[PDB]
Amino acid sequence: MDIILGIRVQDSVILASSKAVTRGISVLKDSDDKTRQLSPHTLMSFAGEAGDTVQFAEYIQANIQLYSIREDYELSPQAVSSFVRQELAKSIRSRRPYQVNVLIGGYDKKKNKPELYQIDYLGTKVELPYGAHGYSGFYTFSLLDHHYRPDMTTEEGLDLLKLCVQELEKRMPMDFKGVIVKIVDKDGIRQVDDF
């Protein structure tokens, strides 16, 4: 798929992901949710080749849910991101690699800190205050570089995110049909239904 953004503020991680699914010459859907809840305090958004994206996301989801049951314990965002990276690093030298890029937004309940991890299809992991995949960063990073502060509130983060989306809507040739925004914090995961 197309645009996926992430921003880590003071006490939460915000993931924004486009709603469009374009298969061919037509936009088949304009309400697609490009994300999966891996654990109560860990959310993963994804973009890449058709089929591989959802197949990979659901496979990771199942594995983390399995771990959660076995140990009766939620893995830290760092631990989940390392597991995901390894799977992608394993994938790149396979017969047919997963063509999937992901952002992992999580709230570490032990450290009481939000954490955003950016991982591409090669297994290239980076922890960031804000991140993106594909061409999304080209349009948005100059705005994020300018306005971002580590002590931002969730409401300020959403305003900076709106500015990023507005710039995308202005200068991107493709119509990505807006974004679904989700917030990850100490209380868990919730969707901002009006954006």
Partner 1 sequence: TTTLAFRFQGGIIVAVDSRATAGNWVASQTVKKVIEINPFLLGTMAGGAVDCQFWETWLGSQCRLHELREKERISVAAASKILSNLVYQYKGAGLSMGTMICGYTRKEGPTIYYVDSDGTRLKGDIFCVGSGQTFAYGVLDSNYKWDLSVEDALYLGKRSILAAAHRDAYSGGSVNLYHVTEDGWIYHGNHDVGELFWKVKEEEGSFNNVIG
Partner 2 sequence: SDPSSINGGIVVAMTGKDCVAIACDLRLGSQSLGVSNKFEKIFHYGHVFLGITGLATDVTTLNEMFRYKTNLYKLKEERAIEPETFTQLVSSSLYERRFGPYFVGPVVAGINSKSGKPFIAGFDLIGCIDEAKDFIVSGTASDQLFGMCESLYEPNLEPEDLFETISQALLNAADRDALSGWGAVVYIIKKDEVVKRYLKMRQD
CB 48 within 8 A of CB 121: yes
Binding-site size for partner 1 (CB under 8 A) equals: 35
Please report whether residue 123 would count as binding partner 2 according to CB under 8 A. Answer: yes
Residue 20: contacted member of partner 2, partner 1, its own copies, none (CB under 5 to 8 Å, by partner type):
its own copies
Q: Minimum distance from CB of 51 to partner 2 (Å)?
A: 22
- Report the Cα–Cα distance between both ends of the chain, in Å, rounded: 20
Report which residue type is found at 1. M
Interacting span for partner 1 (CB under 8 A) from 44-52, 67-75, 100-108, 115-123 = 44-52
Given its own copies, Mg ion, partner 1, none, residue 121, with its beta carbon under 5 to 8 Å by kind, binds none
Give the binding-site size for Mg ion (rule: CB under 5 A).
3
Sequence-separated (6 or more) residues with CB below 8 Å from residue 31: 19, 177
Residue 92 binds partner 1, judged by CB under 8 A = no
Burial 40-68 (b: 16+ CB within 10 A, else e): ebbbbbbbbeeebbbebbeebbeebeebe
Stretch that binds partner 1, among 49-57, 62-70, 77-85, 178-186 (CB under 8 A): 49-57
- Tokens 């991140």 sit at which residue? 131
Q: What gap in Å lies between CA 127 and CA 78, rounded to an integer?
A: 9
Interacting residues with partner 1 (CB under 8 A): 21, 23, 25-26, 28-29, 32, 49-52, 54-55, 96, 128-130, 135, 137-143, 145-150, 163, 167, 170-171
